[PDB]
Design a binder for this molecule. Structure first.
Ligand SMILES: *[C@](=O)([C]([N]C(=O)[C]1[C][C][C]N1C(=O)[C]([N]C(=O)C1=[C][C]=C(C(=O)N2[C][C]O[C][C]2)[C]=[C]1)[C]([C])[C])[C]([C])[C])C(F)(F)C(F)(F)F
Ligand SMILES: *[C@@H]1O[C@H](CO[C@@H]2O[C@@H](C)[C@@H](O)[C@@H](O)[C@@H]2O)[C@@H](O[C@@H]2O[C@H](CO)[C@@H](O)[C@H](O)[C@H]2NC(C)=O)[C@H](O)[C@H]1NC(C)=O
Ligand SMILES: *[C@@H]1O[C@H](CO[C@@H]2O[C@@H](C)[C@@H](O)[C@@H](O)[C@@H]2O)[C@@H](O[C@@H]2O[C@H](CO)[C@@H](O)[C@H](O)[C@H]2NC(C)=O)[C@H](O)[C@H]1NC(C)=O
Length: 218
């Protein structure tokens, strides 16, 4: 996250860190004790058998006992278009179930087809690059962003941090977009480079997939 701040320890218990060989590579949201939601391009060309789903984390550099680690067991995708970046959502079923607690909580989703309006205040988070060039975050960052509709496909939910050079950057993909306490986006792609100050970042619109997500997570 470029231009944000450190989230209070365990402020967002549904936040998940996807990792390959000790290193975080994508964000995800816990949506059921045994289901995580992320961006389809995260598991795209990656050895899924080796991806570890870390829950209950805050500061990735330290050994935290709050953490619960699961492995992916099943992959569900619904028309992910790799070239046009459409339907960039993947449901990953875990090999076990998170013990729900103060650190590990389940996220809530909007209703099927709940379109966000231009100007809505939302909060983004992730452990991605701290700067266009500056290293990956170690402590979960958060960022106040505003929904916009200009310079944005209806097949995406875009945000813009008006009047500043801030936004999601590499490593935030998969991370949630919580608007009104509901996950309305799944960090997908940026334009003009991270934090251009000119282009909106695009999130996968969770709302347009609520029915599918449910038929799976039951
Ligand atoms: C992750 O955290 C990051 N995401 C990415 O790197 C995504 C995944 C694949 C490519 N990508 C991008 O962000 C790229 N953005 C685009 O491909 C892109 C830019 C511009 C346009 C465009 O002009 N459009 C006009 C019409 O509307 C549609 C948009 C389209 C597509 C970028 C690198 C070039 C972060 C969220 C940034 C991750 F990918 F998982 C990572 F961690 F692995 F990086
Ligand atoms: C669910 O999977 C976890 C994580 O499995 C590890 O990571 C995978 C990507 C893969 O590399 C596995 O071989 C790894 O074991 C399991 O947690 C581990 O379980 C083993 C055996 O009990 C233990 O030695 C490890 O320390 C555990 N923790 C970690 C972080 O690896 C977990 O037991 C699996 N099953 C259930 C029901 O949760
Ligand atoms: C920056 O964002 C915080 C948090 O945003 C809210 O909570 C998110 C989870 C999501 O639901 C967003 O849509 C919400 O806007 C804002 O903090 C809130 O501030 C109000 C008073 O201004 C307070 O009543 C709430 O309790 C706060 N919410 C939390 C979760 O602490 C904050 O106002 C935003 N800052 C700016 C400048 O807009």
């Amino acid at each position: 996250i470029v231009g944000g701040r450190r989230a209070r320890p365990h402020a967002w218990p549904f936040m998940v860190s996807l990792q390959l060989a000790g290193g975080h590579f994508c964000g995800a949201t816990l949506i059921a004790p045994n289901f995580v939601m992320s961006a389809a391009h995260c598991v795209a060309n990656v050895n899924v058998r080796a991806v570890r789903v870390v829950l209950g984390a805050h500061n990735l550099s330290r050994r935290e006992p709050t953490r619960q680690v699961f492995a992916v067991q099943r992959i569900f995708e619904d028309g992910y278009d790799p070239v046009n970046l459409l339907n960039d959502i993947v449901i990953l079923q875990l090999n076990g179930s998170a013990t729900i607690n103060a650190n590990v909580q389940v996220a809530q989703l909007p209703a099927q087809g709940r379109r966000l309006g231009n100007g809505v205040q939302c909060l983004a988070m992730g452990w991605g690059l701290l700067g266009r060039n500056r290293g990956i975050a170690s402590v979960l960052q958060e960022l106040n962003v505003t929904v916009v509709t200009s310079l944005c496909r209806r097949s995406n939910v875009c945000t813009l941090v008006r009047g500043r050079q801030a936004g999601v950057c590499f490593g935030d993909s998969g991370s949630p977009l919580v608007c009104n306490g509901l996950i309305h986006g799944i960090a997908s792609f940026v334009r003009g480079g991270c934090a251009s100050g000119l282009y909106p970042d695009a999130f996968a619109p969770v709302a347009q997939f609520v029915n599918w997500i449910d038929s799976i997570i039951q």
